[PDB]
Design a protein around this ligand. Structure first.
Ligand SMILES: [Cl-]
Ligand SMILES: [Cl-]
Ligand SMILES: [Zn+2]
Ligand SMILES: [Zn+2]
Lengths: 259, 259
């Protein structure tokens, strides 16, 4: 129902071009793991959009929480320092866990994992969560003389589509889990990880379901009235790596993907 | 703080490296407009992080709303087509409005504008909003035989910091307006734009404050109890370009930045 006098001429022409592209339909092809970036082809502009379908991809999203009083303009520039200590550490930790794909969005970082990296994704997320709780929050509190800033985290797992868009070219991701992992992180309290029920249902080991004894780690949370999610239930983890047993637990959990 | 038995050895070493970087402090320098990407220098890794301070930068964030039933796996693959029709049109429209910087995050797109592009940012946002209402929503409803999918939108304006991080290199943005524009969009209803009070307070012309008569366009909304924003009030726009007067209004609004 678009009319010429409703839009700029250029906008009108662009919208009609996008309508034509949309009317071409799509094609897809299955690829079991996140492909190398150069294996994602740039298409000729006349073709129907082609997507690669990655099954049961895991998306972790971590975001700074409680930072509204941190500043980029006042003398201490504390938001700049906090951004580095939070985001750069997130990136380096996810890289150390051999994350297939990392990207930065606002005050947050998302990390994509393959469907056979369930436990690796969790171990990387809990490592970052523990860093934030034990290091980031105390140091920012020291610098600000009292402000408590931390993180909150979400994980979802679902099939996604990927292709490249030129703005160079970047991967673009269509589907549920990146959007849903970010929405879960936004819903989470400070120092809380929320995961979807479909991701939680893939966690089977007592190394991740029960504490070290220093109890059930995960609590269900109904998310239906949020009107944001295509699943009924999330699961909440508020604990972190044990100061005594955390390394041993992380070692075992990482190995759980190899079986 | 950190204990060695709480983390993997590699994670421990990485955290200590990030603490050292954080303890170097930061330096900043003012640049009045969003710089060219090659003017944002890559630093040697030993230096305190340097940031460019861009005053009163405008961030628009547009996001798909109501898409939980769209699928990337069922036969119609409707989420793939919808992603193209929504996101690619957003990209092309923002490029047509000469947006200095565009980036894609999940089901959404953000566009950054200079402080002297107040009205251009609004005109680009309302153009995309009108496209979504008049074109995207009807076509997706037709394809799905009834599902109503649309968009929601946020705008904030505040000083930001920018530098480059290598994961070639990408700009990273620290500060309020990208995070806050995304949170405003998440808070917005379908076919609703929410803007911060500080952005709204820069809107002075009746071309943006009053309708063509086919009334006040903006309604205040208190956002204090959201505990997410560093401002008290947002402003809601639910209208779109008039089917008769929309081109004329958009043209005049664009001209408002040149005075
Ligand atoms: Cl600030
Ligand atoms: Cl889906
Ligand atoms: Zn223990
Ligand atoms: Zn009118």
């Amino acid at each position: 129902g678009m009319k010429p006098n409703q839009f700029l001429n250029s906008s009108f022409s662009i919208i009609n071009e996008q309508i034509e592209i949309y009317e071409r339909g799509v094609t897809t092809q299955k690829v079991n793991q996140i492909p190398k970036t150069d294996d994602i082809r740039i298409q000729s502009s006349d073709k129907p959009w082609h997507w690669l379908e990655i099954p049961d991809l895991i998306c972790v999203f971590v975001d700074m929480k409680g930072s509204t009083q941190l500043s980029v303009t006042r003398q201490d520039r504390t938001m700049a320092s906090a951004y580095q200590l939070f985001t750069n550490t997130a990136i380096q930790i996810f890289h150390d866990f051999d994350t297939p794909y990392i990207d930065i969005k606002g005050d947050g970082v998302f990390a994509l994992f393959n469907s056979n990296q369930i436990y690796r994704a969790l171990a990387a997320t809990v490592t970052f969560k523990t860093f934030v709780k034990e290091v980031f929050t105390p140091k920012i509190k020291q610098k600000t003389k009292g402000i408590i800033v931390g993180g909150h985290y979400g994980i979802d797992q679902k099939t996604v589509l990927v292709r490249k868009i030129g703005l160079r070219y970047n991967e673009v991701w269509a589907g549920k889990p990146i959007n849903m992992a970010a929405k879960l992180a936004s819903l989470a309290n400070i120092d809380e990880l929320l995961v979807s029920d479909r991701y939680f249902n893939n966690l089977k080991s007592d190394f991740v379901l029960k504490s070290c004894g220093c109890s059930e780690l995960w609590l269900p949370k109904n998310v239906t009235e949020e009107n944001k999610f295509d699943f009924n239930k999330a699961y909440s983890l508020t604990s972190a790596w044990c100061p005594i047993h955390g390394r041993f637990y992380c070692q075992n959990i990482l190995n759980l993907d190899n079986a």
